[PDB]
Design a protein around this nucleic acid. Structure first.
Lengths: 312, 312
DNA sequence: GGGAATGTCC
DNA sequence: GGACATTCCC
DNA sequence: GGGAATGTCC
DNA sequence: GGACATTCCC
């Protein structure tokens, strides 16, 4: 039958979440294949159906139990953290440019989360699959402002207080639910939602852009063991490592690692390390390698900086 | 006439203000003579009176006025940010062990300040000195029964807005107010309040003690102009200099300055600078000097480090 | 984006 | 007490 | 918020 | 030695 697919995933990394105090106008969420010269944005497509329809986007959590997220989508076609776009009559590909992710503060998570649940229990933005599987009246179609019961209050409150402690504010996922026209019911044919790849906040320490601001020494002996002070952007003492490497024309690249313990990482912004030994202790002319920061957890690197090895 | 006297003042520096999240048991405010083994506490005494008396302690601002402070007092006999002790009926000296200072969130200064300034006008806590000079309705002592008008509550609001904007969350002062029994039996006779010395939050960036953690080069030539990388603790870029001092004959401390712009302060934790030229460039023996961090604002220093000036 | 003040956690 | 994550500000 | 380190009673 | 404050110090 008819279904909804993700044509272009959102870019997992390199985008920064913004707080309410940071305002908007900090750029739109880019697509997985976006570039500076040719910009690209997340895109879905309605399959096995043509004609008018609507697609709603909303942030969900990242764990196994897909739950609502306290952050919000902001920008064009965005209200109350939910982005709604009408799918064209001819073109079924729905793009989402100028999208923004509003980073809600830790304090405001619970009240924001409990609000989203009470909104989805009335609007019908997938009530059971997100709030809790205990709410019975997953029936939606609208029903107007609907109604509230003093049992649903307890259910919503407990779901919110539970999902608050289970929520990571550094990673969100887009969820696209498509709605097709009904028997003059405007739009209420709920297609199964499609969760996108996890989006990681650029401001998070384990996802920020690695960079080597400067280095104490740019040349050292092949025997290694040379103490160097490296000034860098924010790193995590237990997660960072310093890699020298050279790309051999043979095919296999050589890599060594500067030696340091988490104690040598000074206040997340500098590293004192001893250099490794070059693979050729008995070299004739100086060899030219590069050095870079690398995160153990996800192997992200930094712009390499040159380095020279000398004979004895 | 009976008065109140501060026997031992609170130690002005070294004590760190704590937030609610940091919990209790992070130490009480030590007296000025307390030490690592002999631990004293802030203590006062009601002179020219003997009998049951009630002493209260509040936090007040350090500015050109004595306004109520948004921070709170916590610990034994502390409730609602106010400390209350009962001295007597024979001993009129009373100390305050386990008396910590709770740092209020910036986002809760106004509502806290306004709530306390309104309580000061209802019972006449010198509202012309603690709240606003316009509210000079000193209904002190036997007050407690006054409903504020719609104009006085607006003076309280504007004072709360203004004092919030000018409140220094890094310095507080203890105010001790003594109460003696009246003709009935309960404590009503309010003696002169006494303001203590100013307590300075050690955690403030404008008062955190400087420290040189590491240096890449422990020596340098006398000609100066050598690039040295220095790892330090949290310092402010526009308010830091590196001083090489030599204590020679009859004092005469030779001072050289490390050359660096504020942009060379790497993220408040590192300085890349150039050594100055030594006093006598023509020496022939390594001349031991010391190097330290100096805060151009108040000229406080760190623990110095040795640094040898070798000739050529 | 880059940087720091502010609040949190150990 | 030391170190860091979080939030704010430019 | 962990470790250590006392000082209780048991 | 165990439980249980109580404190001190990162």
């Amino acid at each position: 039958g008819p279904y909804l697919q993700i044509l272009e995933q959102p870019k997992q990394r390199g985008f920064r979440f913004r707080y309410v105090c940071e305002g908007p106008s900090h750029g739109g969420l880019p697509g997985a294949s976006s570039e500076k010269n040719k910009k690209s944005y997340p895109q879905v497509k309605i399959c096995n159906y043509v004609g008018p329809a609507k697609v709603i986007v909303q942030l969900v959590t990242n764990g196994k139990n897909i739950h609502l997220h306290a952050h919000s989508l902001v920008g064009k076609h965005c209200e109350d953290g939910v982005c709604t776009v009408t799918a064209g009559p001819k073109d079924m590909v729905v793009g989402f440019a100028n999208l923004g992710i509003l980073h809600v503060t830790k304090k405001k998570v619970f009240e924001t989360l409990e609000a989203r649940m009470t909104e989805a229990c009335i609007r019908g933005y997938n009530p059971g699959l997100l709030v809790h599987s205990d709410l019975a009246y997953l029936q939606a179609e609208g029903g107007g402002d609907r109604q509230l019961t003093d049992r649903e209050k307890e259910i919503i409150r407990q779901a919110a207080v539970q999902q608050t402690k289970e929520m990571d504010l550094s990673v969100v996922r887009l969820m696209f639910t498509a709605f097709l026209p009904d028997s003059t019911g405007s739009f209420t044919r709920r297609l199964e939602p499609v969760v996108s790849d996890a989006i990681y906040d650029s401001k998070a320490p384990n996802a920020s852009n690695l960079k080597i601001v400067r280095m104490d020494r740019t040349a050292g002996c092949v025997t290694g063991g040379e103490e160097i002070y490296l000034l860098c952007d924010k790193v995590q003492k237990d997660d960072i490592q310093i890699r020298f490497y050279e790309e051999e024309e043979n095919g296999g690249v050589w890599e060594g690692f500067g030696d340091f313990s988490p104690t040598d990482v000074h206040r997340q912004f500098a590293i004192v390390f001893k250099t490794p030994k070059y693979k050729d202790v008995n070299i004739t002319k100086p060899a030219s390698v590069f050095v870079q920061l690398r995160r153990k957890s996800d192997l992200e690197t930094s712009e390499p900086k040159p380095f020279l090895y000398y004979p004895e």
